[PDB]
Amino acid sequence: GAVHGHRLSTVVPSSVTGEVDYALADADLAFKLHYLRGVYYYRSGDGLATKVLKDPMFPWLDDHFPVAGRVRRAEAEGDGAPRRPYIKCNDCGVRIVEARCDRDMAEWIRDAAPGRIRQLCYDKVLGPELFFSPLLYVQITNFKCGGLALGFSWAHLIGDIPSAATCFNKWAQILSGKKPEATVLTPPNQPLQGQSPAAPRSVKQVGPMEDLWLVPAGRDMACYSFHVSDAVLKKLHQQQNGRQDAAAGTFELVSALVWQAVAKIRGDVDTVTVVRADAAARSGKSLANEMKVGYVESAGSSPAKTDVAELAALLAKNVVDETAAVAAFQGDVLVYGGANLTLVDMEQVDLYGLEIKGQRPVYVEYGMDGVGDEGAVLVQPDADGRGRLVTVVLPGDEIDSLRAALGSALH
Amino acid sequence: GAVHGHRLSTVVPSSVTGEVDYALADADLAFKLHYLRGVYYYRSGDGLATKVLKDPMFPWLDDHFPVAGRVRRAEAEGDGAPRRPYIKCNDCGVRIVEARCDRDMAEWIRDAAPGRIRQLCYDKVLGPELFFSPLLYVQITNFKCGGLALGFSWAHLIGDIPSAATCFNKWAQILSGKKPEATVLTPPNQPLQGQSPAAPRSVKQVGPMEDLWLVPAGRDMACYSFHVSDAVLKKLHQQQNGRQDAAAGTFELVSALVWQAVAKIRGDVDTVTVVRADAAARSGKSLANEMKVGYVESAGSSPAKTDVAELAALLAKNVVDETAAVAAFQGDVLVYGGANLTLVDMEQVDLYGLEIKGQRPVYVEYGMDGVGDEGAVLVQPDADGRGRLVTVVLPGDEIDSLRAALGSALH
Amino acid sequence: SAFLVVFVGTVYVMSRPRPVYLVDYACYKPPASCRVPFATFMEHTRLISDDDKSVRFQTRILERSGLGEDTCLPPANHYIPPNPSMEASRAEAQLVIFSAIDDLVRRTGLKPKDIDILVVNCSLFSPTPSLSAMIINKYKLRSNIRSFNLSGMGASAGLISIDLARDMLQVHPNSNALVVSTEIITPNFYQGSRRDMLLPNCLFRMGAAAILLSNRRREARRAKYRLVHVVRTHKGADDRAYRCVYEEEDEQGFSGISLSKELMAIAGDALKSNITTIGPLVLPMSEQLLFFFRLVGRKLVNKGWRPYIPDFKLAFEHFCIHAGGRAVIDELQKNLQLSPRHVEASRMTLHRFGNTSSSSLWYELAYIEAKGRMRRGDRVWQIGFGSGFKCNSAVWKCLRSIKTPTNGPWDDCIHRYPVDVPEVVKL
Amino acid sequence: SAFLVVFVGTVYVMSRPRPVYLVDYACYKPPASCRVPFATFMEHTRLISDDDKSVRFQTRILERSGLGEDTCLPPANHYIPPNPSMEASRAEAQLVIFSAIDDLVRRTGLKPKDIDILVVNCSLFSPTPSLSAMIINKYKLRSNIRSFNLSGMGASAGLISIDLARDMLQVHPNSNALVVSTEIITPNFYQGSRRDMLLPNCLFRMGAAAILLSNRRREARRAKYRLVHVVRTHKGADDRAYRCVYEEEDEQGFSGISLSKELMAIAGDALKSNITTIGPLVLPMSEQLLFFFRLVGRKLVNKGWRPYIPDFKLAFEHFCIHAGGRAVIDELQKNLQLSPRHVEASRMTLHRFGNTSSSSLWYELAYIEAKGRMRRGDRVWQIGFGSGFKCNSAVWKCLRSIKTPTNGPWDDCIHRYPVDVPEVVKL
Numbered sequence A, B: 001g002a003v004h005g006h007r008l009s010t011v012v013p014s015s016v017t018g019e020v021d022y023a024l025a026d027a028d029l030a031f032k033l034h035y036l037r038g039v040y041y042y043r044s045g046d047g048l049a050t051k052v053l054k055d056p057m058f059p060w061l062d063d064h065f066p067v068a069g070r071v072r073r074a075e076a077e078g079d080g081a082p083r084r085p086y087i088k089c090n091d092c093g094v095r096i097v098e099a100r101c102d103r104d105m106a107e108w109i110r111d112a113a114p115g116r117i118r119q120l121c122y123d124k125v126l127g128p129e130l131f132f133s134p135l136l137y138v139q140i141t142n143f144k145c146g147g148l149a150l151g152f153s154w155a156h157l158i159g160d161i162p163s164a165a166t167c168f169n170k171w172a173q174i175l176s177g178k179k180p181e182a183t184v185l186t187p188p189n190q191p192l193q194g195q196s197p198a199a200p201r202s203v204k205q206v207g208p209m210e211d212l213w214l215v216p217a218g219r220d221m222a223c224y225s226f227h228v229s230d231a232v233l234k235k236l237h238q239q240q241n242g243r244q245d246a247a248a249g250t251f252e253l254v255s256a257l258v259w260q261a262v263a264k265i266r267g268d269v270d271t272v273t274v275v276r277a278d279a280a281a282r283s284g285k286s287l288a289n290e291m292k293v294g295y296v297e298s299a300g301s302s303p304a305k306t307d308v309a310e311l312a313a314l315l316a317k318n319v320v321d322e323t324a325a326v327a328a329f330q331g332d333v334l335v336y337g338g339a340n341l342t343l344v345d346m347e348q349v350d351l352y353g354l355e356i357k358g359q360r361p362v363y364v365e366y367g368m369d370g371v372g373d374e375g376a377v378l379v380q381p382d383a384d385g386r387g388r389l390v391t392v393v394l395p396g397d398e399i400d401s402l403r404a405a406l407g408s409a410l411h
Numbered sequence C, D: 001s002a003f004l005v006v007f008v009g010t011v012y013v014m015s016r017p018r019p020v021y022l023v024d025y026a027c028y029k030p031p032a033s034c035r036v037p038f039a040t041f042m043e044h045t046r047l048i049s050d051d052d053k054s055v056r057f058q059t060r061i062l063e064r065s066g067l068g069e070d071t072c073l074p075p076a077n078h079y080i081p082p083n084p085s086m087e088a089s090r091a092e093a094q095l096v097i098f099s100a101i102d103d104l105v106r107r108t109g110l111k112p113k114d115i116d117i118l119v120v121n122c123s124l125f126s127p128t129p130s131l132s133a134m135i136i137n138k139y140k141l142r143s144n145i146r147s148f149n150l151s152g153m154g155a156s157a158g159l160i161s162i163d164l165a166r167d168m169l170q171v172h173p174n175s176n177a178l179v180v181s182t183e184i185i186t187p188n189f190y191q192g193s194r195r196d197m198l199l200p201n202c203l204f205r206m207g208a209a210a211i212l213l214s215n216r217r218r219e220a221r222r223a224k225y226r227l228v229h230v231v232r233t234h235k236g237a238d239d240r241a242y243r244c245v246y247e248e249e250d251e252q253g254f255s256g257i258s259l260s261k262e263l264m265a266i267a268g269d270a271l272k273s274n275i276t277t278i279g280p281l282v283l284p285m286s287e288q289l290l291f292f293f294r295l296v297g298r299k300l301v302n303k304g305w306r307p308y309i310p311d312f313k314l315a316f317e318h319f320c321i322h323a324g325g326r327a328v329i330d331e332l333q334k335n336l337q338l339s340p341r342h343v344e345a346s347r348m349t350l351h352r353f354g355n356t357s358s359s360s361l362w363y364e365l366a367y368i369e370a371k372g373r374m375r376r377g378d379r380v381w382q383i384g385f386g387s388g389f390k391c392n393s394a395v396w397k398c399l400r401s402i403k404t405p406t407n408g409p410w411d412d413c414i415h416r417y418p419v420d421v422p423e424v425v426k427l
């Protein structure tokens, strides 16, 4: 029941942008080695033919023209050590991969098997032809039950994860006939000096690659995405008796449970990373890598068998924020899973706002690519809006045993 | 250096024959299971493109229109136990197979490896679609020297071997600008009545064959064409000192040599068949099987102990000719290689009369298909007219043993 | 009146249209080195195909087709499988066309600088540059020649080119027109297995015709025919008639012409819409009274009498119905109430030359000429039908009696024609 | 005299030709969803191509081609690799044509039952039934329409269609003539790797024009132009000019248009051969005197003089040279000594629409009308060159001053044109 019949095409901005060079910020070039894979499942995909889905992509790329641009480099005729990349806003466009899968969509959603976000997203990267590689791929998979899955392959260079989701929802609003919110690309980004030669302990200095923006891990990753229910969420609120704590019960407890499950299997996962998709730290810009990167350590007893309330109160309080030194660094930095197990806070991100016509999605899962060999944990919202969806990117030798360790608590 | 690039094409008669039914003789239906494989090698095929060679085949088949027909079957008048075939003269045509070989021809002529006649003649058969199978295939193989090989795959049903050779020579005469002689089909063939329920001991009565006119062998057949020279022919004439002989000194000595050579390999080949292409038994007809098939017994000592002179003495005079009882038998028989070893007298046949423009062939060899697992000896003429060529169609178990057993006398 | 007749004598001769004379025409006779018999076609079909449901269908189609054994295919369909190249189809276009213009310039005394108008038509094959530019390059025609290449217009575009060359010879006085009507069979072949697309494989054969028209009065005593009328009728507004002869691609990706099973009902209704236009033009008003002495007593007494159609055998001496198939000449005979001698040129043209698409009318005209039947003053009716269901018709009038040694495509074999044709070919 | 002057008013009045009026035309403006930028083309090329020499060639071709960012390809070249089917080729022919006739009948009030002559030309794509039969089937035109479908005649066949409609309006009084000039890019895409056949991939874009001509004198107050002359020049007799634009098949079997490197030397000599025919027709005799007096003193005074052909800038006010490429308008400008404002419709048409083959002249005419430069009495010169090197030329005379809101293909972008087109675009 594999996906087959991939037909490649392109959508461009309907208006000519011109000879525009979109400058990338210092936080954009730090997240350039990572890639977002998001799948949006729909129960009925009739009436959404692939001209109906593609015609609003031409006014949507008028507002988001750096997503249709291409990566170039600016020449430096002094010393050859700096060459800052930018987005040359030619209207090269966004890949549209029409595919079809002759399996059932609802049976594949409840499969809980390692590997559905790779078959439903076009697994490409800003690759060895860097100057001619698209920044966004949209795969439209039609199922035999009438279902529809939109798989978005978003480069973390051009935008964040809430920036990616808002960019997709602004296409869904044009397709629904609504008027989208205005996109702010207006203040251009400038480079920063300050001379930080020491990388933070939340990131891992990988080698100075030049034209392939991907780090191979050696062990193949697999996005196992399980579901955290409402009953086990408030069951995790039964370990904080007699104390008050600022731990948000839907992110710190869930990521602490996954941290406990990973550290039960590995030897010592002492330091972790929290990459928060906060909203108060956002500017008005629509394509900006404004996360909140920071490292949390135990600083004492090992987190392998302590209870998850202690790790939740430890993660919500003892975070040492490092989001500015990651951007102020000069080399390739590999934040997502490079040095430590990342715990991402994609829970206030409007995933289910991809209402196509009046059709809210049945299930939305987000994976990643380019994750280093420590792991990434993506805590997402649920369809009803109360539970959590946790996609875990791990080297494959552990997901057979995370399902054994997490199932004792998730029932 | 194999033959490749086969392109198939047909040549029809230029004038419409109409609804003519060529009645077959009782001798034509006795030889329907065998076929002829004749290759004519040429040094220089310059100007002889596969339009110059194919254009005289349209006047050539106006005279030889049964060769361009197909074989059908008539229905019985009472109970349907016999069904005598006939050649329905629909102008279906003669296959032309334009092939090429990157090997040089002068190396391949003097190679002595079995399987050369099979590659230069299109090995087809009046086979599983009997009503839609050609009676003649002409393969034109272009070599690296510019040398030309005409491979004629002739069905032995429609004509004899001198009938095949004169039918090819009348095409080469039209090609060279000459005028061919008269093609006589004027007396129509008719069945006979002789009351013959017993098969002769010169053929092998095979079972009922309906829509495949080829008896399979089961072993790997191999046609090995070795050259017997003038000097070894005069060494054969020193063994009748003081003895009166009536053996023709170029066929019975050579076929007796091959007979005792295969009698030293096989156990006891006591009797053999001689298929003489006798010039006096031929009538005026141009497509008819006027052979002289008859067995000859040893009637005394074994043919593995004796020498070739007494073998030729018993081979000339002790032929009990059964060429009327071969044609008079009802069931399907196997002449060549069926019951005993056959020693064909294709030696007064004008093989080298295929002068296509002004060019005598360098080398002409004839093979046979459909030979049973006893063997066929084809004593052919050479280009000089003095020496001979012998093509031995035997199974591959005893081809490499024959090259050693004959090497003691051939030098 | 004695002086005011020059005003009438100059208003009549400047309003009278220019006569268009057919000086001579030459039809391509394909050689016997390209003939495809019934058995050769069936064995070529049986080798490349695997299913015996298509071969048994094409056997019935070819045996009920009304063709013969002298029908010729190009030197690419003699290969198993065929080779539909572009150079192999362009070299066939340099064989059927250039041998028809060479036959015409040697029997007319025509100069290549004398040709003013060149109208070439071929339905499927339309290369870049045109076949008209190919003729201009070969024969070195003038730079101010008015060349047209009508392509895609089916088997009725011969009379479209004849009407085009007629309408160009009214504007341009003292000019010659060259009309070439051919059909290149090398890209026309169907390599698939759809049954409605295999009928053009069993019908269309090699053929071409070069036609010399003129409006000069010097070439009015040498000329053969005078063009009287050309009547066009386009049934393409109907959806059933537009998609009747339709070029599609099957589910395996092979192009071809797909004929409809309802084609013979549409070809009959395209003729009766053409009969209603050409009827008042050519029928004598001795018995054009069917609409004034017979119609006025209908809608007050009884609508509908038993049929007495307008007798077109009183208006024409010769008929040249296009040799599409056996069943289409069989139906347009019974619509026109024709004798079997009237449909003899069409039947023997389909038997001898097959369905040469745009040029069957000229082989039929050469049949009527080469039998010695073209007398002086004989009126000829050429009915031609094709794709989009344009059904064009032309009325020629014979100027001089043609002598039966004709030097045409028929003179090698017309001592045997008309052949008696049974409706099956037994196998 | 006072009584016999009617012989002057009967011989001269009945020998004048019927005037042909360009009532209106309608160019198909392609949507912005089908546009192909530079980077999209050079990435779609780079994904299919294994040869890294062909992309370095097509980069130079497309960056010095003179095209822009709004050039539109059909919705089958937007796939990687393209899908040049026949159903996708018919879907483009039903889109570029049926949206240019719908634009024409809504701005003229044309009825489908008024169209008497239909002349469609498309060079490479010619289905069966033809595009004229497609227009007849869609718009339900009459059965007695004179429809013609000129295929294979290259990019200069727009003026061949105009000359054909002009000659058909001389024979048929009180008639309307619909002329459709398009090019279907879907079957024209070259899927191979030969460098001479990769230039039509980087030039030819979508476009069509539907043109309404008439000889009715009632439509002389409504019409925009009057046809003065059409001059045709066929350079096909030269073997170099015949094989200049040639449709071949490469060594892998892909059909395509193979442009030659000798094209500008042939197009210049096919233009100056056309200039010697249109010269005595349109040039004023106040400076035609160099062919009457100054050629007397060649073997009388001097052999070897100053380069001076007569100025066509005195003859016409507007020029509509066919937008073939950058180096072809650069070469046909110095052969005529044209100002940069004279070659501005051609350059901006090549920049905005690309090399639409047969409709570039109508896009250039719409550019001149959109800028408000088309005044009353202005003469237009439309030069078109194509394959077989037919190099046709037409002279229109403007009848009424065109008001600048035109509702043509330029009104969404005419405020930014003319664009300063660089010699090489920035990479």
Ligand SMILES: CC(C)(COP(=O)(O)OP(=O)(O)OC[C@H]1O[C@@H](n2cnc3c(N)ncnc32)[C@H](O)[C@@H]1OP(=O)(O)O)[C@@H](O)C(=O)NCCC(=O)NCCSC(=O)CC(=O)O
Residues within 6 Å of the ligand: C060, C061, C064, C065, C123, C153, C154, C155, C156, C195, C196, C197, C199, C245, C257, C259, C260, C261, C262, C263, C324, C325, C326, C327, C328, C357, C385, C386, C387, D128
């Ligand atoms: C009438 C014939 C089918 C033969 O008569 P038959 O006696 O065989 O007919 P029949 O009723 O017994 O059945 C014939 C068998 O073939 C099938 N059959 C018949 N016509 C078919 C068609 N157009 N498409 C697909 N199948 C068809 C029938 O289904 C049937 O199959 P089954 O056995 O299962 O029932 C054939 O001769 C014929 O088609 N003549 C018309 C020729 C024609 O169409 N010319 C168009 C050229 S116009 C042109 O030139 C313009 C252009 O090209 O541009």
Ligand SMILES: CC(C)(COP(=O)(O)OP(=O)(O)OC[C@H]1O[C@@H](n2cnc3c(N)ncnc32)[C@H](O)[C@@H]1OP(=O)(O)O)[C@@H](O)C(=O)NCCC(=O)NCCSC(=O)CC(=O)O
Residues within 6 Å of the ligand: C128, D060, D061, D064, D065, D123, D153, D154, D155, D156, D195, D196, D197, D199, D245, D257, D259, D260, D261, D262, D263, D324, D325, D326, D327, D328, D357, D385, D386, D387
């Ligand atoms: C002139 C241009 C190559 C661009 O100018 P340049 O400055 O780049 O030229 P250049 O001297 O630097 O060299 C360009 C490179 O391309 C190669 N090159 C140029 N023309 C070529 C051709 N016809 N065929 C094959 N190769 C060609 C050169 O060999 C050279 O290769 P290298 O790099 O090795 O040196 C191009 O704009 C052009 O060809 N314009 C003409 C367009 C045209 O022919 N239109 C006809 C439409 S007729 C029509 O419409 C009728 C119909 O369709 O039927």
